[PDB]
């Protein structure tokens, strides 16, 4: 049983670590979308492209 | 390239597949980074002779 506990516990730490890295990528995109909405919708940006 | 080891490594299931898939995503992204920086121009503009 201690092999199954070890494998499933290592599998679950693998999933949570992958989701932590994937969440940081999505947060970096949500900060860009909040910036785009503030400058482009609520204003008129002169920042090229 | 041992046979006997590979038949044990199979019993750990999807670990090896998702490592190859992770490094593949890292490798593909390096071309995207290079495209976004340099390929901002539609046509190859060329300087006059004078």
The DSSP call for residue A41 is I
The DSSP call for residue B10 is G
User: Is residue A14 a contact partner of residue B15, using CB atoms and an 8 Å limit?
Assistant: yes
Token pair 């494998």 is found at: A7
- Alpha-carbon torsion (A28, A30, A32, A38), positive or negative: negative
Cα dihedral angle (A15, B34, A48, B41), rounded to 10 degrees? -140
Interchain contact, A7 vs B12, CB within 8 Å:
yes
Provide the angle, in degrees to the nearest 10, between the axes of the packed helices B15-38 and A2-36: 20
Method: cryo-EM
- Cα-to-chain-centroid distance, residue A43: 27
What the block records as the tokens of A9 is 């516990």
Expressed in Å, this structure's resolution amounts to: 3.4
Chain B contacts of A7, Cβ < 8 Å?
12
Cβ-proximal residues to B12 (8 Å cutoff; 6+ apart), any chain: A7
């Amino acid at each position: 049983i201690d092999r199954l506990i070890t494998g499933r516990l290592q599998s679950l730490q693998t999933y949570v670590t992958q989701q932590l890295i994937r969440a940081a990528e999505i947060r970096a995109s949500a900060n860009l979308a909040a910036t785009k909405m503030s400058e482009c919708v609520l204003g008129q940006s002169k920042r090229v492209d | 390239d041992s046979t006997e080891c590979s038949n044990l490594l199979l019993q750990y299931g999807s670990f090896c597949t998702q490592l190859n898939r992770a490094l593949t995503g890292i490798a593909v992204e390096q071309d995207k980074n290079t495209q976004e920086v340099f390929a901002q121009v539609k046509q190859i503009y060329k300087t006059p002779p004078i």
